[PDB]
Amino acid sequence: SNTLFDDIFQVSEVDPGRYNKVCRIEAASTTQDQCKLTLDINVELFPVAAQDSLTVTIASSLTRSWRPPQAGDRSLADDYDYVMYGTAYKFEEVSKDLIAVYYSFGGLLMRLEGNYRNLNNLKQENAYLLIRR
Amino acid sequence: RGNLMGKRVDFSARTVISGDPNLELDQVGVPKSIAKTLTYPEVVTPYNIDRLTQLVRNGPNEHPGAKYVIRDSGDRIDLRYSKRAGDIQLQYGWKVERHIMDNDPVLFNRQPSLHKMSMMAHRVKVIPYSTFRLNLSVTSPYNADFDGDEMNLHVPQSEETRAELSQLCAVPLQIVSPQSNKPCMGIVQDTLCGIRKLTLRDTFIELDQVLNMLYWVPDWDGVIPTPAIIKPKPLWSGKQILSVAIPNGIHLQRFDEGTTLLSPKDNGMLIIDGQIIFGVVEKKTVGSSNGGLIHVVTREKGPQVCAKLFGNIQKVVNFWLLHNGFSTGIGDTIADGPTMREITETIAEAKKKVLDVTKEAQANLLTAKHGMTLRESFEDNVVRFLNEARDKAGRLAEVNLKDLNNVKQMVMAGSKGSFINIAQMSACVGQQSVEGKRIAFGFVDRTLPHFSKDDYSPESKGFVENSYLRGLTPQEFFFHAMGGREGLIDTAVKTAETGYIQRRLVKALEDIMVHYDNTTRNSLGNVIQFIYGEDGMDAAHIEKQSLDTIGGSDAAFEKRYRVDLLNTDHTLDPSLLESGSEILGDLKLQVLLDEEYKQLVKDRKFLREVFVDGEANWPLPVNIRRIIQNAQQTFHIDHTKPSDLTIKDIVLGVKDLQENLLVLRGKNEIIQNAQRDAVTLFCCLLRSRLATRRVLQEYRLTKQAFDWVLSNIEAQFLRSVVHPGEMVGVLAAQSIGEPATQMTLKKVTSGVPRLKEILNVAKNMKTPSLTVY
Amino acid sequence: ASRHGQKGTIGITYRREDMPFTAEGIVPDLIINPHAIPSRMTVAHLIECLLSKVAALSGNEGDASPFTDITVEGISKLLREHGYQSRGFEVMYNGHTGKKLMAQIFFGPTYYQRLRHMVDDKIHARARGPMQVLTRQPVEGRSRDGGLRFGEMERDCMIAHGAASFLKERLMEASDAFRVHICGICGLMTVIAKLN
Amino acid sequence: FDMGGYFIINGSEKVLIAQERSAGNIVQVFKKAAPSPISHVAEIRSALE
Amino acid sequence: TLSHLRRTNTPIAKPRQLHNTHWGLVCPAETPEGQACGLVKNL
Amino acid sequence: MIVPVRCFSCGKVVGDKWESYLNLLQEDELDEGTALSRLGLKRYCCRRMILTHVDLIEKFLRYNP
Amino acid sequence: YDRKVPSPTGEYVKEPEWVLETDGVNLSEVMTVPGIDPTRIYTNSFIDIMEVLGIEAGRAALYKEVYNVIASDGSYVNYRHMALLVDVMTTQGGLTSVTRHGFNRSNTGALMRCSFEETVEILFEAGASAELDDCRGVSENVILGQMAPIGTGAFDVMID
Amino acid sequence: MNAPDRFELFLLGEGESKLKIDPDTKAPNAVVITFEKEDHTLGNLIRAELLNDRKVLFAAYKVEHPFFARFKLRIQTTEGYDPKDALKNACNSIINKLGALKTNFETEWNLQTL
Amino acid sequence: FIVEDDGHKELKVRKGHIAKLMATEYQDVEEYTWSSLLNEGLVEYIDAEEEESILIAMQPEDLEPAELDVDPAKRIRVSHHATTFTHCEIHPSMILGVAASIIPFPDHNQSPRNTYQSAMGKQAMGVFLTNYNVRMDTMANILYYPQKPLGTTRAMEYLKFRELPAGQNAIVAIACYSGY
Amino acid sequence: SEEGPQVKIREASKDNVDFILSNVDLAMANSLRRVMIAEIPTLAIDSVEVETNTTVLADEFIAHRLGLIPLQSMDIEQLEYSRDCFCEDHCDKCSVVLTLQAFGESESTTNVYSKDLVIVSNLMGRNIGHPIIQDKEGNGVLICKLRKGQELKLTCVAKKGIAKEHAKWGPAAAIEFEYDPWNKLKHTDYWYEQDSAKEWPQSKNCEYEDPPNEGDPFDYKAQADTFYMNVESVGSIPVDQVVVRGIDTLQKKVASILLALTQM
RNA sequence: UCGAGAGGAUU
Numbered sequence A: 001s002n003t004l005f006d007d008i009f010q011v012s013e014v015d016p017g018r019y020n021k022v023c024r025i026e027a028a029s030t031t032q033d034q035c036k037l038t039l040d041i042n043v044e045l046f047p048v049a050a051q052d053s054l055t056v057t058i059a060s061s062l063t064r065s066w067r068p069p070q071a072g073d074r075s076l077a078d079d080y081d082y083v084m085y086g087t088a089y090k091f092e093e094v095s096k097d098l099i100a101v102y103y104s105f106g107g108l109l110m111r112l113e114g115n116y117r118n119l120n121n122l123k124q125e126n127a128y129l130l131i132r133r
Numbered sequence B: 001r002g003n004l005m006g007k008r009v010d011f012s013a014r015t016v017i018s019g020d021p022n023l024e025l026d027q028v029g030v031p032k033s034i035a036k037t038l039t040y041p042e043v044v045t046p047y048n049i050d051r052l053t054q055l056v057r058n059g060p061n062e063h064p065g066a067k068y069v070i071r072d073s074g075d076r077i078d079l080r081y082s083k084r085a086g087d088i089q090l091q092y093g094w095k096v097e098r099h100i101m102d103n104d105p106v107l108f109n110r111q112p113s114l115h116k117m118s119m120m121a122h123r124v125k126v127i128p129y130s131t132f133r134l135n136l137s138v139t140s141p142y143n144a145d146f147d148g149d150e151m152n153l154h155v156p157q158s159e160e161t162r163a164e165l166s167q168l169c170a171v172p173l174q175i176v177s178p179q180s181n182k183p184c185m186g187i188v189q190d191t192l193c194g195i196r197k198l199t200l201r202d203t204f205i206e207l208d209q210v211l212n213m214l215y216w217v218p219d220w221d222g223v224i225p226t227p228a229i230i231k232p233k234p235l236w237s238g239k240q241i242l243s244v245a246i247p248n249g250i251h252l253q254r255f256d257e258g259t260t261l262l263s264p265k266d267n268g269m270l271i272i273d274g275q276i277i278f279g280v281v282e283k284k285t286v287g288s289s290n291g292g293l294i295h296v297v298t299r300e301k302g303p304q305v306c307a308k309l310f311g312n313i314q315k316v317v318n319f320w321l322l323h324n325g326f327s328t329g330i331g332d333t334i335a336d337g338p339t340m341r342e343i344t345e346t347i348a349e350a351k352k353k354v355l356d357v358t359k360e361a362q363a364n365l366l367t368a369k370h371g372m373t374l375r376e377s378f379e380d381n382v383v384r385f386l387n388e389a390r391d392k393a394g395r396l397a398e399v400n401l402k403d404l405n406n407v408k409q410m411v412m413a414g415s416k417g418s419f420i421n422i423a424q425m426s427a428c429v430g431q432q433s434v435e436g437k438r439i440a441f442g443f444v445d446r447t448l449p450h451f452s453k454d455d456y457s458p459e460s461k462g463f464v465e466n467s468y469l470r471g472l473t474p475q476e477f478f479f480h481a482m483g484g485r486e487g488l489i490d491t492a493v494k495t496a497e498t499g500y501i502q503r504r505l506v507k508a509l510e511d512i513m514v515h516y517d518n519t520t521r522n523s524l525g526n527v528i529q530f531i532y533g534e535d536g537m538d539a540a541h542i543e544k545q546s547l548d549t550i551g552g553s554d555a556a557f558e559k560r561y562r563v564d565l566l567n568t569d570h571t572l573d574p575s576l577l578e579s580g581s582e583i584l585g586d587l588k589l590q591v592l593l594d595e596e597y598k599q600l601v602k603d604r605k606f607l608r609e610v611f612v613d614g615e616a617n618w619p620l621p622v623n624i625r626r627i628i629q630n631a632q633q634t635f636h637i638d639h640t641k642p643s644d645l646t647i648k649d650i651v652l653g654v655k656d657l658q659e660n661l662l663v664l665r666g667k668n669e670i671i672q673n674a675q676r677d678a679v680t681l682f683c684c685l686l687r688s689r690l691a692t693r694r695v696l697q698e699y700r701l702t703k704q705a706f707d708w709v710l711s712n713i714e715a716q717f718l719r720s721v722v723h724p725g726e727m728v729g730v731l732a733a734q735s736i737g738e739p740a741t742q743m744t745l746k747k748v749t750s751g752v753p754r755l756k757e758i759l760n761v762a763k764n765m766k767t768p769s770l771t772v773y
Numbered sequence C: 001a002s003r004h005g006q007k008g009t010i011g012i013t014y015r016r017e018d019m020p021f022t023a024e025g026i027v028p029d030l031i032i033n034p035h036a037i038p039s040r041m042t043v044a045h046l047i048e049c050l051l052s053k054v055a056a057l058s059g060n061e062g063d064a065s066p067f068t069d070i071t072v073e074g075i076s077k078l079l080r081e082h083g084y085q086s087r088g089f090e091v092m093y094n095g096h097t098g099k100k101l102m103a104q105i106f107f108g109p110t111y112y113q114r115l116r117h118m119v120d121d122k123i124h125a126r127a128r129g130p131m132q133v134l135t136r137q138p139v140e141g142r143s144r145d146g147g148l149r150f151g152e153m154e155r156d157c158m159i160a161h162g163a164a165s166f167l168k169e170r171l172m173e174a175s176d177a178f179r180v181h182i183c184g185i186c187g188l189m190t191v192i193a194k195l196n
Numbered sequence D: 001f002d003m004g005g006y007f008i009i010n011g012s013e014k015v016l017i018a019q020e021r022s023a024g025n026i027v028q029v030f031k032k033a034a035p036s037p038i039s040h041v042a043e044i045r046s047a048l049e
Numbered sequence E: 001t002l003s004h005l006r007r008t009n010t011p012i013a014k015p016r017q018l019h020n021t022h023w024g025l026v027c028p029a030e031t032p033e034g035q036a037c038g039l040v041k042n043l
Numbered sequence F: 001m002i003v004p005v006r007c008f009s010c011g012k013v014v015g016d017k018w019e020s021y022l023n024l025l026q027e028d029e030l031d032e033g034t035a036l037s038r039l040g041l042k043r044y045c046c047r048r049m050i051l052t053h054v055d056l057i058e059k060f061l062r063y064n065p
Numbered sequence G: 001y002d003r004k005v006p007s008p009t010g011e012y013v014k015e016p017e018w019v020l021e022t023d024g025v026n027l028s029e030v031m032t033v034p035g036i037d038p039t040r041i042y043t044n045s046f047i048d049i050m051e052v053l054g055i056e057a058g059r060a061a062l063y064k065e066v067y068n069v070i071a072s073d074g075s076y077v078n079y080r081h082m083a084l085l086v087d088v089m090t091t092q093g094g095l096t097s098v099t100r101h102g103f104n105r106s107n108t109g110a111l112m113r114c115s116f117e118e119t120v121e122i123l124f125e126a127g128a129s130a131e132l133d134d135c136r137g138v139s140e141n142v143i144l145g146q147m148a149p150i151g152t153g154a155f156d157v158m159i160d
Numbered sequence H: 001m002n003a004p005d006r007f008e009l010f011l012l013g014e015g016e017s018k019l020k021i022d023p024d025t026k027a028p029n030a031v032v033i034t035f036e037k038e039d040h041t042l043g044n045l046i047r048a049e050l051l052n053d054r055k056v057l058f059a060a061y062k063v064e065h066p067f068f069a070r071f072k073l074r075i076q077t078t079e080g081y082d083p084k085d086a087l088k089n090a091c092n093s094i095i096n097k098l099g100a101l102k103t104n105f106e107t108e109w110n111l112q113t114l
Numbered sequence I: 001f002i003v004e005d006d007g008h009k010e011l012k013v014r015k016g017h018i019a020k021l022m023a024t025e026y027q028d029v030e031e032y033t034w035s036s037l038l039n040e041g042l043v044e045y046i047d048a049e050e051e052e053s054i055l056i057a058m059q060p061e062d063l064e065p066a067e068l069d070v071d072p073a074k075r076i077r078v079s080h081h082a083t084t085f086t087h088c089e090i091h092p093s094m095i096l097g098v099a100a101s102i103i104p105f106p107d108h109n110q111s112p113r114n115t116y117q118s119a120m121g122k123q124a125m126g127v128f129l130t131n132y133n134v135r136m137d138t139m140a141n142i143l144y145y146p147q148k149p150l151g152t153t154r155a156m157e158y159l160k161f162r163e164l165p166a167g168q169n170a171i172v173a174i175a176c177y178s179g180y
Numbered sequence J: 001s002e003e004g005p006q007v008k009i010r011e012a013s014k015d016n017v018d019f020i021l022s023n024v025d026l027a028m029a030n031s032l033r034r035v036m037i038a039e040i041p042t043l044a045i046d047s048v049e050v051e052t053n054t055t056v057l058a059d060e061f062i063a064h065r066l067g068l069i070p071l072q073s074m075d076i077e078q079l080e081y082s083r084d085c086f087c088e089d090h091c092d093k094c095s096v097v098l099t100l101q102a103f104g105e106s107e108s109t110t111n112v113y114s115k116d117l118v119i120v121s122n123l124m125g126r127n128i129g130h131p132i133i134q135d136k137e138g139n140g141v142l143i144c145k146l147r148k149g150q151e152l153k154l155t156c157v158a159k160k161g162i163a164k165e166h167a168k169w170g171p172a173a174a175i176e177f178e179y180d181p182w183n184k185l186k187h188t189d190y191w192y193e194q195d196s197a198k199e200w201p202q203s204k205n206c207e208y209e210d211p212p213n214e215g216d217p218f219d220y221k222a223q224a225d226t227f228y229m230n231v232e233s234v235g236s237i238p239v240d241q242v243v244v245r246g247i248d249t250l251q252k253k254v255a256s257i258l259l260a261l262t263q264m
Numbered sequence K: 001u002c003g004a005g006a007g008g009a010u011u
């Protein structure tokens, strides 16, 4: 029960799809070349302008009821400023030794393709996303 | 026809109707005054004598009560005024005429009842006010408004009479209709407009709004879902909160114009395990249709679970729309200034086209089209010209209609609206039609006395350049008044012939009952169909499903279906089966693959002969697209680990399955061959989807999951048979009569008069024709 | 009903507290739905709600006469001078919670007509009531405490459900059941009935 | 504001409604149908005022 | 009451449709529905 | 048929302003819009109680019994 | 016209073709011409198709014209309902119309036909011809006020 | 004719208690309270006040039918914490807030001179 | 109205002959009435047969000589392009009946919708007569507090609808609220 | 000054009060408005017996009108509901009896104002039953008009009640309500055609809140705490006791729950 | 009991 993926991305396109509080972001992975992602982001909470640099992570934790944080006792496992919860509904296979995963953060959708995440992102429903500044 | 076919009867009712979403679907709102008046004889039992004696003590003045008491001798006891009404010793076997109470079966009616689903049972919910309360989503199989409409009610008087309402004529039993092989009831106006704005991704709700929304589901597990967004402020999506209404184990896939697996427009729909994945819910998702959400839950979960699903969906969506609001002003019809400047420019270009064509016609330079008079070519040209400008300016308006335009959103959800209404309200209403033609000359050589004679221009022939918002001129108003009276005439005319047609259809087919052999017969016993519907299946448990043996190239047919055991490149990889390396070049086993492939090729020949147009989407009695997703979900499947099946389990199992899909149980050769004829198309689908490559590569089953698929398909098929005794000709007559009543609107006899000529077989048709090849 | 074919019965009676309100505390006397508007295209209904608003504030009679060169934009120019939304909308707060409604509501006065139909004048009920002598069937109409007709079109539809035993109760025990004696050789209603 | 225009018979305000008719003493030309042996007709509704 | 004093009953080949000559004399829109539409019309 | 006491929408007492209203229109020769604003009616819910009202009771008492 | 036909590879592709459309019918002497396909020609007049191509070829010509009426308004009805109507007209061997003089000429008892248009003279001829009635009809027992053989009424109940 | 008497909105009828307590099935620390002869006037002020207390999990009301006046309230709390104790202190928090409002308002009233 | 040549084609009636009518309207000296208009030759009685032979202008501004910047929101009205005028209509609103003349803005409306109200507007409750208390008719229904309409046709004045109405100015909000 | 809710009054009158209501929950001010409209007790007529009526109006017309007549209820807390008392029909401790007499003696038409109502029952020294006259002329309110020869004679039995039973027991009418005049909370989605700012009018309360500088992002934590309000009174109860009793009646309503809970 | 008329229903 720990971090499953980490990378840092530079955004290329922000697309408001006839919307006011939601944009479709388009970013490739820096420090790599054959890895890019397409993600839906609530702009009103975290403003994501063009040419930003977004540290992105995915964990499995940190069913049961969602109680409020209530205190510092239920300490957050994040120094980020954005988090979401999604479900793994499709894992695409673009080619041999290449893989793409699809997530749905309650209607907000996530595209992510790459090579080396083939030890995590299992078929379990539980899936998180965390985005730093 | 008026005292024997139908007659006035006791235990009747009539009131006005009104819609209450907090009423359940099968519930009905019976006021107390009518409930105080109606009665049901309940014999006294040792179980209910404690309740029944209490109801007599209440008295007939206030409900719950009882109007009479019947003893063994039968001398009636009037409880309205009797000296011994207070003290009564109810011996066993006495009859008590108690008042109608909650959760009782009553027949809900409507006029006209030209429909099987217009006479349905209802649960009684006694309510204080005077109207007949009903759910919103029961308007469709009654065709009711609340403007002035009245509805009747009848009450059973015996136990078997009570059972037939509850178990055959209930609302959930008649959700799926034999007519149109689809449901009738669906989510409606405020729910249908609310479900669109709720399920938008821009729409988000906070915790205080969620908890009220969450508790509003009546039966609910009590777990709060983890929010979509948690870090800045915990926010729930409309898609998140709506998923609580949809039960676990429901799956749905839908594709339209732009449907990626990302869906940037959020069109399409994908539902997995009762939590919707992406999309915007609208009329195509929830309106009563082929493969709708109600079509899934009624077949999979059952009638009562789908009936309660109407309640939980409405109470959540109405609650959001309660606290969000929705309206419609005249700014929802006002278009942009520059958009209007293009619209009248488009009309002027069309009017100049009519001028220049008229000058061409006036100089006799027109080339007469073959098969028509020269003057008829003038009308055919100009009418098609003006309809182009109307349709262009109307589609010019829908470009300029912003996303917050309240008229557009009702059309965007398909609640109550169409494209043409936007064109008439904003851009240009257009040409008027009188008996298929333009405005004729009632005056001598002119349509109106304000015009010079022999004026064929659209301004003088009935074109309304101005729109409804812009303001009609007196000439344009009178021309519109001329055309509108025809539609009021046609509406009054068409309803007269339709009710006669439905009478002729019912009285011809009333004896048509499927006997206890599936031989459709009548009172004399003359066979009409040897198998009902030529297959023997009920139209309710029927779904459209694509069979892909028809489509695709012969090469793509091979790559999808060719398993050559004795090959290296056309054999299944042993990562797809446990015995992959062991089963290679097996001569006693490869014969089973090619024999399978030989019937699949013969099946492709059989279907391509019949379905010449190439359409594969066709009504078939058992869905397999849904059933495999059940086996994919009930048993957790991973693509990495291979199956645990021999090929001989698959091919001999399917061959064993076809022998058991029974329709007729005669041992005779003619009936058994007719049984082979009856299931031939369904087996053609079943062999296509239960193929050796398809099972082990497309949806990698296991031995246990495969035997359940054989178990579900056999049971669903056996349940989806026509039950003998079903009156089907009366059902078939109403199945054509009801959509005929909705028929109201190149020179071909069409619509209702064409339907009149077909039935009343015409020696002299108005428009006969030959189609030559 | 209004003056534009928009019929409609009273679904419920709400008090002022439950009703939504504007910033000036004005409450609607009557609430209708947007979904009855585009299907019937009653734009004059929508303009009468707008024009009567400006007529009330100005205090002068609103001119809704036909074939008059009067524009909505000219009317909406006047309503902007009175400090409102020009096209008729008003910020409305939900009376249940005090939370603002996201969709601003079309608000204005509209001349409405009370129809001659009332529920209590139309409500009917019968069990074991009066019977005509000729047919031995219940009398016609609600005026004589009569019963509703279980007509042939209902008999047609109820056949399709397969409710045969329901039909016998509807055709015998509900009304005009009778017992007669017939001779077996002479198969007609003939027999001397010395029952007692 | 009662504008009159009605008879009062047995206490009930009876109104004589207008009746519509084609004009008399006019020549009218009516084309006959296809299966009719005659092809045309000229009709006049002759009646003294 | 005003509209019942201006009404024409027609006892009874396309009569019910609104005619061009009906301009200025009979009302274009005021007519009953259903049973006899266009036969009964108001001035 | 006679001046209502209160506006049905809000409930402010409007029945007392009628005797002033016609006298505001006659001896002062004022405009209808300024007459309602002078008499304390500032919302259009109560404003339509006086403008749209036609006092039919003057015709009823003309009948001698 | 636009029509889909198999390519030699196998996929369905759009093959356009020219088709003549007329305003008259004598199909007995139209198919016997050169240059046409006498296998797939069609008229919207099903009454002549019964005369020319046989009775059972009139069935599909009857259904297709009914189907074209239904889909003209954008509607949809299942096949078993219309084919029930089409076969009922067809099963007599002629085109039995659903009208007063199309099917009421039958042997279907006496009281079933009395519920339709010609009421008294049907009974008078039944009184004349002394027609014994089967009393198995829906309208026979509804007039008789009995539990007709309608679903629930088809099977009796017995005790062991 | 059929309409009920108007006092049923605020007068308790025949043997009808003001509050009926029932624990919600398939939930821990859950109870539902059948408030009688009340409306949104009372429901929203309790529900918004329960959300301020950070030891309360679930708090929501619903009118079962606007015909009648009986809104239902269901609360869920932390372990070892009956909702009645969470209800009473939150209800008392309104009484302190209302009484402080009345005292603060009356001083501003007397200061105003008209 | 009667149109005849003068220096050019124009109406017979003038603005001076209007004031004699309005002077008779104010006094409510020689009075000027409808029979005075016809006798003087300023109006005519036209039926369906005679109007076959005439050319009618709709508005009396169609006799103005023709000759840019204009308001876009107004209706598009065709220039008649005809000059052999014989008569002019009084006002085009007159073709409507008594019931449809109550309807506000019937030009901005579907033609069945104008029909639909004009068949149940005769059903609306209202004060039919001032002597309802004196008279004894079998069924009478009277509104408590009727109101004149806030949107009035010009033809309402001659139908006495303002002086004897049949409905109230209910404040109406069009809202998707309460699901009822 | 005391901790919790704060109040600052902008302007006031005998029948209108304009105040800011700082530092409260939104559910409080809404629920306060509902009890202020509905559940505040105030006396008005509930039973009328008619001796003689020669008017052009029927009696139920008049019985309707007498209900809407405002009656003073300043000291209404010492009066008792007739449902609570032990009298046979109604007494001096529950009801207040009124009488109305008018005769068309004058040649000209004679009105029947509210000031011509007269009081019969025992007051017992409490400020009740006085028909309020806010008229500058001093004549109360129109009830009927009388020709010469007409007469009217009846009795009016006033009883205590609230607006939930009938709207004649209405303490107030048309209370204003606005919060966030700039929509910095994003509680509403503005419907616009070209520009939301120019088409929508500025609220009058915009000057008493800080404007949103559009360069700053959305405040995703601020909830509604400052509510602008105006209270209008008919005249049956002065504007101070309109809101204060409504606070008290709501306070009484929650206390009945706590009393009901302790008994359980 | 019979004949007649005015409406209400079907978007």
Ligand SMILES: [Mg+2]
Pocket (backbone or CB within 6 Å): B144, B145, B146, B147, B148, B149
């Ligand atoms: Mg209707």
Ligand SMILES: [Zn+2]
Pocket (backbone or CB within 6 Å): C183, C185, C186, C187, C190
């Ligand atoms: Zn015998």
Ligand SMILES: [Zn+2]
Pocket (backbone or CB within 6 Å): F007, F008, F009, F010, F011, F012, F043, F044, F045, F046, F047
């Ligand atoms: Zn008001």
Ligand SMILES: [Zn+2]
Pocket (backbone or CB within 6 Å): J081, J082, J085, J086, J087, J090, J091, J092, J093, J094, J095
């Ligand atoms: Zn007392």
